[PDB]
Design a protein around this nucleic acid. Structure first.
Lengths: 123, 51, 222, 258
RNA sequence: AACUGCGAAUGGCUCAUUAAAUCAGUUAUGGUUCCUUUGAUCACUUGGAUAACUGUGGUAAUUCUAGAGCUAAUACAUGGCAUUUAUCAGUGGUGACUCUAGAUAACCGCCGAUCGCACGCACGGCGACGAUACAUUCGGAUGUCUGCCCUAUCAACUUUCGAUGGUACUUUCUGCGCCUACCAUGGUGACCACGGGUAACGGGGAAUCAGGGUUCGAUUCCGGAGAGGGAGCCUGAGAAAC
């Protein structure tokens, strides 16, 4: 049923990664989730699903096939450095601070009024 | 338009799909159509569970 | 009129309100340059001499030194001028400033004690406050003490007692800047090394080019 | 209009960069450097668009900041470095060495070279002046000032320098019979033997180049970069050296390889 | 937090102005200015001020600030070339120098008091920052050639108080009536000057089209212009900046 191809593998020793375009064949399934693709990609490359980052799965019309992109790092430490913070947030690794960007500009423009150590008391 | 016709393992839904020579011998029913090798439609499945 | 008096010797200052205008009649003609005696201010100030260092008018505008008037004027204040802070490099905003001449229409008049009199004010002269910051430059320490060029400024550091309630006590010392460290001697030594590498490469590039023209001119000579 | 411009639109970008439309509004504006804006290939495009080593501009900066890339031997951390013609892009981490040389289509193709190569590079002299104390100087096409050059080197010859020391190793004089790669549009990337030079006083000197297959074509003197003495190039040439197959011949070679 | 450094002169928006102007093609700076990038070139470890901070304040009010007490620097300051003429000769040049260099007579800034890492043998490696008489890049500025709609119910126009040219300055980043002084009386025009209109930013372009055309282009790209209307400036490599 569900298979994986990786038709455009690349070593890419510059970022300690493994670039490839993942093709998933799912005739009856519905756009196989990342958790099933990562664990199926870990046994394909003899690695752990904790260092596999897949994204960009776009299912073709009619169904049965979808194509994406995958990243396999040498270690989890090299992943936390080279992988964007938003894909680490898709895992239990990175936690983005709820800062409410609209409110960040408010505190900044208020600190632009007072001068000195009193800026810390503003916000 | 009802997603039954496919062209060489691609469900084509456009009637104005201009078929070329190498794609003419590969026109067949989709692998999920009740006419092809697929589960029958909702009408057949609903009329079956009644009786 | 309120009086903001400060004592530079003891580092103390206090604000007092002088309701009796007879005591301020001496100041009503002195500019922001003279040191006058504070005898009319009361029996506590006997022998004191105060210097008019500035003040604010009834609208809050500060006194600007050199205007030579007693009314407010508007001057194009650039960087470096008092009573103005540029928000952008090269900004000149015309602001209203109070003249240097001291009159009765002032909110507060700043005074600086230039000579201690006979008695002493409890809140102005009795109490004292340290400097709160010792010298940081290596030469400032040598001038503070009697240290010569042979003494170690690392031993004669301030090392102020920094201890609050709820934490472990410790001592904090400032980083001695402009100090002759073994590192700064390496930079000076390496700067000289590069000056000799260029001198070495100039005489080589000029010799090899002279040797090239020498052997080449011998060919075209015949 | 009040000063220098610091942006570059994708529609106004050089065409040989081969940038698409729907990716973004701005194109990577190459920082100031040895090569001109219209005649260079910024490091972000070469790593991402060509080598596919990175997918975004942020991933390009993660590579350049690790000091893995050396242009002409020296490490460059700016992702918008010009890195124009004849420049050597050495990547010690992956053991790959490149040299930017145009193809028949007039674009910087991925030209991988050997470890024995990537130690030298060819440079075209553009200006010769005598400095102070009677010291002759030199100006290559990549802003490399060279002191004490060979007196036979003139304002149009091609020198060979060493990337480790920056000293002139050899030089090729500009004369009829030497190779050259045109670098001035409509012939950008074509390699042939110089056959004739038309000298126009006060104007641009037009030279005539002849390919190996016999194709003749003219260009300007400022677009000629001497490659080798005679017909032997001193550099490694990419596939399809300078022939520039016609649209009819490229179709035949396209369908024959099917 | 603050000092210092840098950016804020890009972007974004609008089409008011503007009809040989802008703009487009061509091209010249041998008449020029350019932060940055790139390659060349290169001890008495000194002096006293200041912010943050501490503290006293004023005003109804401002991203207003005053006074006093401190303390740092890649802040501030100290500790042969270049610059300006004159003469002579002819290293590398260009189609063409009053070019680039050289030699004289002089005239009168620059030549590192900085920072990190690695630590080895009074000497030492790798960098950061910083100097520019240079080159280089981003490019400015002003010229060369040619090209614009309607209008004669606009036929002569410019020239006091520059119009055209000459001479010597002044000034500018430079060439130039740019300006000044003294002379010359020119310069433009039915091949349409000058004046007026434009519901005129120019161009790449769009629509419509057998050919030929007609019309459109405020509008995502390039160039210019402006930031309510004018005008004058600061800072800086760069602005007549909003």
């Amino acid at each position: 049923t569900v298979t994986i191809r990786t038709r455009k593998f690349m070593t890419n020793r510059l970022l300690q990664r493994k670039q490839m375009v993942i093709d998933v064949l799912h005739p009856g399934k519905a756009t196989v989730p990342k958790t099933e693709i990562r664990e199926k990609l870990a046994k394909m490359y003899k690695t752990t699903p904790d260092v596999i980052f897949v994204f960009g799965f776009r299912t073709h019309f009619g169904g049965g096939k979808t194509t994406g992109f995958g990243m396999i790092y040498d270690s989890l430490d090299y992943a936390k450095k080279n992988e964007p913070k938003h894909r680490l947030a898709k895992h239990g690794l990175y936690e983005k601070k709820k800062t409410s960007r609209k409110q960040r500009k408010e505190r900044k423009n208020r600190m632009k009024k007072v001068r000195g150590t009193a800026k810390a008391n503003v916000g | 338009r009802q997603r039954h016709i496919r062209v060489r393992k691609q469900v084509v839904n456009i009637p104005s799909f201009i078929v070329r020579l190498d794609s003419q011998k590969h026109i067949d029913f989709s692998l999920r159509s009740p006419y092809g090798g697929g589960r029958p439609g909702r009408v057949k499945r609903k009329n079956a569970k009644k009786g | 009129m309120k009086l903001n008096i400060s004592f530079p010797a003891t580092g103390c200052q206090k604000l007092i309100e002088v309701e009796d205008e007879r005591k301020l009649r001496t100041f009503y003609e002195k500019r922001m340059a003279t040191e006058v005696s504070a005898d009319p201010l009361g029996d506590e100030w006997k022998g004191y001499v105060v210097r008019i260092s500035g003040g604010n008018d009834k609208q809050g505008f500060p006194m600007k030194q050199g205007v030579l008037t007693h009314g407010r004027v508007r001057l194009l204040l650039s960087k470096g001028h008092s009573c103005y802070r540029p928000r952008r490099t090269g900004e000149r905003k015309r602001k209203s400033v109070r003249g240097c001449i001291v009159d009765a229409n002032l909110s507060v008049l700043n005074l600086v004690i230039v000579r201690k009199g006979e008695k002493d004010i409890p809140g102005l002269t009795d109490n004292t406050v340290p400097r709160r910051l010792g010298p940081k430059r290596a030469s400032r320490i040598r001038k503070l003490f009697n240290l010569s060029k042979e003494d170690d400024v690392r031993q004669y550091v301030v090392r102020k007692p920094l201890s609050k309630e709820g934490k472990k006590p410790r001592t904090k010392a400032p980083k001695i800047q402009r100090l002759v460290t073994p590192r700064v001697l390496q930079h000076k030594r390496r700067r000289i090394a590069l000056k000799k590498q260029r001198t070495q490469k100039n005489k080589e590039e000029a010799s090899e080019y002279a040797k090239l023209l020498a052997k080449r001119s011998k060919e075209a000579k015949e | 209009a009040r000063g220098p411009k610091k942006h570059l639109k994708r529609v106004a970008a050089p065409k040989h960069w081969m940038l698409d439309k729907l990716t973004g509004v701005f194109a990577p504006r190459p920082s100031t450097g040895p090569h001109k804006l219209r005649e260079c290939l910024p490091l972000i495009i070469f790593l991402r668009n060509r080598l596919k080593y990175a997918l975004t501009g942020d991933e390009v900066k993660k590579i350049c900041m690790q000091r893995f890339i050396k242009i002409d031997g020296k490490v460059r951390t700016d992702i918008t470095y010009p890195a124009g013609f004849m420049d050597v892009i050495s990547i010690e981490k992956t053991g790959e060495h490149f040299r930017l040389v145009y193809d028949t289509k007039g674009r910087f193709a991925v030209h991988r070279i050997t470890s024995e190569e990537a130690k030298y590079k060819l440079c075209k002299v553009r200006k010769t002046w005598v400095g102070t104390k009677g010291i002759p100087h030199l100006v290559t096409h990549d802003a490399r000032t060279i002191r004490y050059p060979d007196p036979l080197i003139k304002v149009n010859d091609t020198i060979q320098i060493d990337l480790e020391t920056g000293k002139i190793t050899d030089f090729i004089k500009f004369d009829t019979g030497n190779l050259c790669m045109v670098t001035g549009g409509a012939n950008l990337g074509r390699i042939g033997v110089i056959t004739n030079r038309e000298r126009h006083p006060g104007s641009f000197d037009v030279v005539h180049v002849k390919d190996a297959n016999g194709n003749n074509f003219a260009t300007r003197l400022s677009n000629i970069f001497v490659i080798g003495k005679g017909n032997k190039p001193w550099i490694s040439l990419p596939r399809g050296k300078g022939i520039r197959l016609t649209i009819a011949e490229e179709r035949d070679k396209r369908l024959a390889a099917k």
